[PDB]
Amino acid sequence: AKVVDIRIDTSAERKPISPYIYGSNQELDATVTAKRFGGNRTTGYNWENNFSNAGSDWLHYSDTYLLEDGGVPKGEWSTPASVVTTFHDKALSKNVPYTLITLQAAGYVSADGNGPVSQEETAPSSRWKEVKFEKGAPFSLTPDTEDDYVYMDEFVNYLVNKYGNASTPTGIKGYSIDNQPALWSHTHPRIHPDNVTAKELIEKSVALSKAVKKVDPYAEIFGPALYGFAAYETLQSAPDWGTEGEGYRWFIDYYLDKMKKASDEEGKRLLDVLDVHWYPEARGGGERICFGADPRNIETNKARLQAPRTLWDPTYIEDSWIGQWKKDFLPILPNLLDSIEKYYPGTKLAITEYDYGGGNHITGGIAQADVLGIFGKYGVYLATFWGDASNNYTEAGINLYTNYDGKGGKFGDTSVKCETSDIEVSSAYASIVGEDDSKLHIILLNKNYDQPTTFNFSIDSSKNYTIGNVWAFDRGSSNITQRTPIVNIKDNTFTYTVPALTACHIVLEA
């Protein structure tokens, strides 16, 4: 019999949970609170004609994938930024509060959709148009597809026009400075063959932020969208990190420091959100927990259930080069947040890309649930998952927070102290709505693989809870079903045993 005590103090550690941590990049069979238009294809995207390059993902084709994959109407395929408007209309039509858009920064964008771009056609060539941030002239809601340029600030304008600015309801709140620059020369060699440098990146960002913050002072700028650890530390061995990184624990500090400095010189904040991508290197059972990992492998599934700990748990060492050789930077969330504090306070933090694998397995769903619990508890501002609708259990973890009863029910927005006696076998997050603890929401995850877990809840609230309804999903179905309610609460205390590998959302009320 595995017994664990859960302790909650509805009046301690009260912190708001950003509503934007529950987002996605792809369209999911779930309720998400933010949609991001980013990733490899977005780097060479041309708003004037909607053409883009698959880069190395696929023979360097310039084509209409984004119009196809986006579900755009062939009528609009020629309409400027149709791809992005279609993207935002769909978003708005689902009452999704936040739309992040990626702006082109690598330097060039598809001039056509004629297909393959020969190495000989490496930019600049007739296959591309040169991207420029500021137009230095009057914008036109009818861009000139014939010139040799594409203006980013004019791009925002076309948008801020159609939807109003970032302060308006229907407006687009965020803009990202491209996608994974440290990998530009790997993913888009036909656009930026040389390895981006620390100076170049900082320089282009500042340029782009200003260009944009003059078309919409209220818009939020995300950056740099680093693909993974290597870019966090040295911008993937940037050619000038040796000189630039002088006296910097890692590139993250450097970026935050220079963006800050630049912001002081400009007289206004240029960096709104530090944006990084996080794909667990956490290994188990021979393979990595994500990127095509086999759910038959019980050892990897078990490694996945513990992987989330790397985000906050200072006592957890995952099996990976990062756990093995990067302990000075783990847990990663505290370190990233810790860095924001030293070189640019007030700066938000977003994990615009992440996937813990097992998307169609119970553990994929518990990990996702646990990850979402961590983002809210540590102040993450926005998070958009990467993966499609086949990930039924991942979609399950998200709904546990955004729509657990199928009718719009959701986790509270104010996190409260909530401790577990055994973090290895379980996880628990608790919240209330605003400053009112009349209803205490609790996410309770039983990581015990094949044996049940009994939980002893002792809550310290101003209210007396007499009932506790339950919703949950498990190895039985990725569908969240209501369960028998808790009714024997004595002085805000009860015992609830939960089946193996189960994720539930409890809701207590007086």
Ligand X SMILES: OC[C@H]1O[C@@H](O[C@H]2[C@H](O)[C@@H](O)[C@H](O[C@H]3[C@H](O)[C@@H](O)[C@H](O[C@H]4[C@H](O)[C@@H](O)[C@H](O[C@H]5[C@H](O)[C@@H](O)[C@H](O[C@H]6[C@H](O)[C@@H](O)[C@H](O[C@H]7[C@H](O)[C@@H](O)[C@H](O[C@H]8[C@H](O)[C@@H](O)[C@H](O)O[C@@H]8CO)O[C@@H]7CO)O[C@@H]6CO)O[C@@H]5CO)O[C@@H]4CO)O[C@@H]3CO)O[C@@H]2CO)[C@H](O)[C@@H](O)[C@@H]1O
Instruction: Tell me the binding residues.
Output: 29, 48, 144, 147, 149, 389, 395
d(CA 240, CA 251): 11
The nearer residue to ligand X, 7 or 326, going by C-beta atoms, is: 326
Q: Which does 152 bind (CB under 5 to 8 A by kind): Zn ion, Cl ion, Ca ion, none?
A: none
Site for Zn ion in 382-441 (CB under 5 A): 389, 392, 395
Q: Which residues contact 46 (CB under 8 A, 6 or more apart)?
A: 52, 104, 109, 110, 111, 129, 150
Map the footprint of ligand X across residues 248-277, applying CB under 6 A: 277
Pick what 279 binds: Cl ion, ligand X, Zn ion, none; C-beta below 5 to 8 Å, kind-dependent: ligand X
- Count the residues of the shown chain that bind ligand X, applying the rule CB under 6 A: 21
Residue from the set 12, 58, 170, 452 that interacts with ligand X by CB under 6 A: 58
- Alpha carbons within 13 angstroms on the beta-carbon side of residue 6 total 28
Q: At 300, list the tokens.
A: 């990897």
Closer to ligand X by CB, 183 or 472: give it: 183
Q: Which of 9, 27, 29, 57 binds ligand X (CB under 6 A)?
A: 57
Estimate to the nearest angstrom the gap between the alpha carbon of 139 and the chain centroid.
Answer: 32
Q: How far is the CB of 161 from Zn ion (least distance, A)?
A: 35
| Residue closer to ligand X (CB basis): 364 or 412 | 364
Residue 321 in the binding site for ligand X (CB under 6 A): yes
Q: State the DSSP string of 42-82.
A: GTT-BTTTTBEE-GGGGTTEEESHHHHHTT--TTGGGSTTH
With CB under 5 to 8 Å by kind, the binding choice for 436 among Zn ion, Ca ion, Cl ion, none is none
Binder of ligand X out of 35, 41, 135, 283 (CB under 6 A)? 41
Binding positions for Ca(2+) are 48, 144, 147, 149
From 113-121, 176-184, 242-250, 458-466, give the range in contact with ligand X by CB under 6 A: 176-184
Which residues fall in the annotated binding site for Zn(2+)? 29, 389, 395
Among 46, 52, 180, 446, binds Cl ion (CB under 5 A): 180
Q: Which of residues 12-31 bind Zn ion (CB under 5 A)?
A: 29
Q: Which long-range contacts (CB under 8 A, 24 or more apart) does 109-112 make?
A: 109/43, 109/44, 109/45, 109/46, 109/51, 109/52, 109/53, 109/150, 110/44, 110/45, 110/46, 110/49, 110/51, 110/52, 110/53, 110/62, 111/46, 111/51, 111/62, 112/49, 112/51, 112/62
Contact 84, 161 (CB under 8 A): no
- Report yes or no: 131 and 104 within 8 Å, Cβ to Cβ: yes
